Symmetry: C2
Subunit: 67 residues, 2 copies
């Protein structure tokens, strides 16, 4: 399952912080698109776990959809 | 007690994220100095708790000690 999220990243640092919390979670393959403020995650982790993980950054996150 | 932390924030978005995680924790009085990458926190929360809360952002965090 490839989950797509909007994440309000406004600099390179914001992008790297997203990658670090995702790394900490583990069991993920992801790509972070800074200019489009979009994070795509391939994972067996539920949408709720991914959402909660991303929201720990303190950034504004919303779910865009799936696959 | 009055604690000081270094937090590797590079833009205003990074400062907001720190603000959001500290607000979510509660029981804190803080000020964020973006250009100096420093966050001062007065709290009854342990150093451990404050450290862990800051490290949630996925930003690089270190401890600058008691004021």
């Amino acid at each position: 399952p490839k989950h797509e999220f909007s994440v309000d990243m406004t600099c390179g640092g914001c992008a790297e912080a997203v990658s670090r919390v995702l790394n900490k979670l583990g069991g993920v393959k992801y790509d972070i698109d800074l200019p489009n403020k979009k994070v795509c995650i391939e994972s067996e982790h539920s949408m709720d776990t991914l959402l909660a993980t991303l929201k720990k950054t303190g950034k504004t996150v919303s779910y865009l959809g799936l696959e």
